[PDB]
């Protein structure tokens, strides 16, 4: 218990538990690295924010998965260039009409 | 599972965006827009362009 707590090291820091690790904050949480940043879980990875969620990358973005589903309420926007859509079955459905291509 | 849930907006910006679904990809929600310069939809052999 103190006002500030600092941990300075010239090598690795390791935190291990046989239960949860909890980090509760009143203002902000920042995580900055000069290399990779791996977030791995063998059951589930969940994110929930009461605001906008931002993803930025100055390179390619890959989302590999199965049964990828996207849900919206007001608008869905796909902007860019050289847009491509693939798939054996490709149905575009609207209001009382649809096209299967 | 992986869940990205927001209650205001979701914004993704990147040089290239690639989505590869092994089984299914579904898009839902009113006022869907697909834009760009060249837009292609394919299938078994069909190939239409804008």
């Amino acid at each position: 218990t103190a006002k500030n707590v600092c941990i300075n090291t010239e090598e690795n820091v390791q935190i291990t538990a046989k239960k949860n690790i909890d980090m509760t904050v009143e203002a902000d949480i920042n995580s900055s690295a000069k290399g990779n940043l791996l977030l791995q879980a063998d059951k589930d990875v969940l994110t929930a924010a009461k605001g906008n969620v931002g993803i930025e990358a100055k390179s390619d973005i890959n989302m590999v998965g199965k049964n990828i589903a996207v849900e919206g309420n007001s608008k869905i926007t796909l902007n860019g260039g050289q847009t491509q859509v693939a798939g054996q079955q490709t149905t575009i459905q609207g209001a009382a009409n649809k096209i299967e291509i | 599972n992986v869940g990205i849930e927001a209650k205001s907006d979701i914004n993704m910006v990147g040089k290239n965006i690639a989505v590869e679904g092994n089984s299914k990809i579904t898009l839902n929600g009113g006022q869907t827009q697909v834009a760009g310069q060249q837009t292609t939809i394919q299938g078994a052999a069909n190939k239409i362009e804008i």
Partner: peptide, 5 residues
């Protein structure tokens, strides 16, 4: 090979 239904 395209529908309009």
């Amino acid at each position: 090979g395209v529908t309009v239904s």
